[PDB]
Write an enzyme that holds these catalytic residues in place. Structure first.
Site, mmCIF file in Angstrom:
data_model
loop_
_atom_site.group_PDB
_atom_site.id
_atom_site.type_symbol
_atom_site.label_atom_id
_atom_site.label_comp_id
_atom_site.label_asym_id
_atom_site.label_seq_id
_atom_site.Cartn_x
_atom_site.Cartn_y
_atom_site.Cartn_z
ATOM 1 N N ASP A 135 0.744 -0.953 -0.273
ATOM 2 C CA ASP A 135 0.013 0.236 -0.047
ATOM 3 C C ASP A 135 0.452 1.427 -0.107
ATOM 4 O O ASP A 135 2.084 1.144 0.788
ATOM 5 C CB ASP A 135 -0.560 -0.161 0.959
ATOM 6 C CG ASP A 135 -0.226 0.018 2.561
ATOM 7 O OD1 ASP A 135 0.960 -1.003 2.942
ATOM 8 O OD2 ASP A 135 0.005 0.731 3.233
ATOM 9 N N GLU A 136 0.142 2.324 -0.674
ATOM 10 C CA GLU A 136 0.719 3.389 -0.688
ATOM 11 C C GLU A 136 2.322 3.759 -0.835
ATOM 12 O O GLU A 136 3.450 3.744 -0.262
ATOM 13 C CB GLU A 136 0.765 4.162 1.098
ATOM 14 C CG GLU A 136 -1.365 4.626 1.514
ATOM 15 C CD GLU A 136 -0.970 4.348 2.762
ATOM 16 O OE1 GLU A 136 -0.536 4.344 3.286
ATOM 17 O OE2 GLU A 136 -2.591 5.516 2.478
HETATM 18 C C1 LIG Z 1 -3.419 0.230 3.581
HETATM 19 C C2 LIG Z 1 -3.314 1.544 4.178
HETATM 20 O O1 LIG Z 1 -4.404 1.768 4.896
HETATM 21 N N1 LIG Z 1 -2.242 2.230 4.321
HETATM 22 C C3 LIG Z 1 -2.290 3.734 5.150
HETATM 23 N N2 LIG Z 1 -3.376 4.500 5.007
HETATM 24 C C4 LIG Z 1 -4.501 4.904 5.593
HETATM 25 C C5 LIG Z 1 -4.358 4.241 7.326
HETATM 26 C C6 LIG Z 1 -4.381 5.577 8.518
HETATM 27 O O2 LIG Z 1 -6.225 5.792 8.583
HETATM 28 C C7 LIG Z 1 -2.927 3.867 8.194
HETATM 29 O O3 LIG Z 1 -2.058 5.317 7.771
HETATM 30 C C8 LIG Z 1 -1.919 2.704 6.982
HETATM 31 O O4 LIG Z 1 -1.045 2.777 7.531
#
Ligand SMILES: CC(=O)N[C@H]1NC[C@H](CO)[C@H](O)[C@@H]1O
Ligand SMILES: [Cl-]
Ligand SMILES: [Cl-]
Ligand SMILES: [Cl-]
Length: 499
Positions: free
Chosen positions: A306-307
């Site tokens: 992710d991200e």
């Molecule tokens: C898969 C995912 O969710 N990645 C990030 N997205 C936002 C989250 C906060 O709501 C966390 O930072 C998390 O690490």
């Protein structure tokens, strides 16, 4: 009489809603001499001891666990249409009998039993009771096999005992998988022998600065053992190639410019990346996944994905093509966030969808396509089951990037027809992740986890035919006295008519 009702709570007033509830006759009443009869097997006695431990404090009763006689509470393993996790619960003056094919089924039956008993059962000192259990029969089996809860121990570290506490919170609702987010930008939480600095340096702090922490191999093994005794299969996650600052800060060589970034204590995401064009990157990943797999008796290994916003799309795809096979190399099934759907998931892989109602159609399509190609889907929409999301603009903790998520929104949907174009048979289940950028203590975890946690468990367990907000909210409202007696803080949502 909220704490100790005159009459027993209705047989159907439990979460998750059971597949079949047939009330009738008089209730059972646990009295001082009640024995817990189990089969003459280790696994049977194990569930019996678990039950006795739950009841002894509030009842003050001896509640001996024996493999002989005709105990008032009987846990029996036998053939039946209950699968690996289902059970039947019969209640009446003659006693309470929980029947299942496997220990997990008996365990789930116990979770139902503790909800049939009064709120006083949550107390630590002997209570008058009455210890009534509505009469009738419950036949219960799960809709989905993947019913998980995730705890982020990277943003803020939580020790073994605090994780055990959260494990007990989730066990109440028949979750069967515990996803642990063991690494991120603010911390590396598992000791890796081949790269000692990951834990000693990478785990030295957390969001907000100050002490961090990490689990030794032994501590991790203990968490897995405890989770196993609560019938939770641990799914560990080492996020890559993004959300890797803790590792990058520990070893300069892993960085594209060969310089270790500082330890990170902020709350942003998407700025870190392993260096896809360096050979050492893959030696590192292989070493870590190998050591983690050795400590994981479970079938899955989560590699995140992710991200990875500091990882060019083409490099992300190349990276995932190279690393996914490493999981299978160590005998595990890979799981990744749905971004993996854009990087050719390997056969047998599962992807965890954390999209939202507003997510672009192209993104939803990519995931639905992976589902059509055989990739299993784990649903945990950020605007539905992310327990760190604020209930309203006034919630004192949590985040708001995915909008606000009240209790009804979190519960009011159907996993089978959620993602447009996705084959229902590809949906493996659901998950409720609890991120910790804003949570630093067990009580804060409770406030954000409850009351939405039981709802996600229901989506994973209960039949679609039982889904209904107006009636569910009554069953949820009924939990209030239990949580109060148990010391579980929760958000008193105005959408729920709390008892
Ligand atoms: C898969 C995912 O969710 N990645 C990030 N997205 C936002 C989250 C906060 O709501 C966390 O930072 C998390 O690490
Ligand atoms: Cl608990
Ligand atoms: Cl920052
Ligand atoms: Cl951000």
């Amino acid at each position: 009489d909220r704490k100790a009702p005159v009459r027993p709570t209705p047989l159907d007033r439990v979460i998750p809603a059971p597949a079949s509830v047939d009330p009738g006759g008089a209730p059972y009443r646990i009295t001082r001499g009640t024995h817990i009869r189990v089969d003459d097997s280790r696994e049977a006695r194990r569930v019996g001891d678990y039950l006795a431990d739950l009841l002894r404090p509030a009842t003050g009763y001896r509640l001996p666990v024996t493999a002989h006689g005709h105990g008032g509470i009987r846990l029996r393993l036998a053939g039946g249409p209950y699968g690996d996790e289902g059970y039947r619960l019969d209640s009446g003056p003659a006693g309470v009998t929980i029947t299942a094919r496997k220990a997990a089924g008996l365990f789930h039956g116990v979770q139902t039993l503790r909800q049939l008993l009064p709120p006083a059962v949550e107390k630590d000192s002997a209570q008058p009771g009455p210890w009534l259990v509505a009469g009738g029969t419950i036949e219960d089996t799960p809709r989905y096999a993947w019913r998980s809860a995730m705890l982020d121990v990277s943003r803020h570290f939580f020790g073994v005992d605090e994780v055990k506490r959260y494990i007990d919170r989730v066990a109440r609702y028949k979750y069967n998988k515990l996803h642990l987010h063991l690494s991120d930008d603010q911390g590396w939480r598992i000791a890796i022998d081949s790269w000692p600095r990951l834990a000693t340096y990478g785990g030295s702090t957390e969001v907000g600065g100050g002490p961090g922490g990490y689990y030794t191999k032994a501590e991790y093994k203990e968490i897995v053992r405890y989770a196993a005794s609560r019938h939770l299969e641990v799914v560990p996650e080492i996020d890559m190639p993004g959300h890797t600052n803790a590792a990058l800060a520990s070893y300069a060589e892993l960085n594209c410019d060969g310089v270790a970034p500082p330890l990170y204590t902020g709350t942003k995401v998407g700025f870190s990346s392993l260096c896809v064009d360096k050979d050492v990157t893959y030696d590192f990943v292989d070493d870590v996944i190998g050591e983690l797999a050795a400590l994981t008796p479970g079938r899955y290994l989560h590699i995140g994905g992710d991200e990875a916003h500091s990882t060019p799309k083409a490099d992300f795809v190349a990276f995932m093509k190279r690393v996914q096979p490493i999981v299978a190399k160590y005998g595990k099934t890979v799981v990744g966030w749905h971004q993996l759907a854009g990087a050719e998931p390997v056969e047998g892989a599962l992807v965890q969808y954390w999209g939202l109602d507003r997510t672009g159609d192209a993104e939803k399509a990519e995931v639905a396509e992976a589902a059509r190609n055989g990739t299993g889907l784990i649903l945990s929409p950020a605007d539905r089951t992310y327990l760190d999301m604020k209930y309203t603009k006034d919630t004192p903790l949590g985040l708001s990037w995915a909008g606000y998520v009240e209790v009804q929104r979190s519960y009011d949907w159907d996993p089978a027809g959620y993602l447009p174009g996705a084959p229902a048979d590809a949906v493996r289940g659901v998950e409720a992740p609890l991120w910790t950028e804003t949570l630093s203590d067990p009580d804060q975890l409770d406030y954000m986890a409850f009351p939405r946690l039981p709802g996600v468990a229901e989506l994973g367990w209960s039949p679609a035919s039982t889904h209904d907000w107006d009636t569910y909210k009554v069953r949820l409202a009924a939990q209030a006295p239990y949580w109060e007696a148990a010391g579980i803080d929760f958000y008193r949502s105005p959408q729920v008519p709390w008892t």
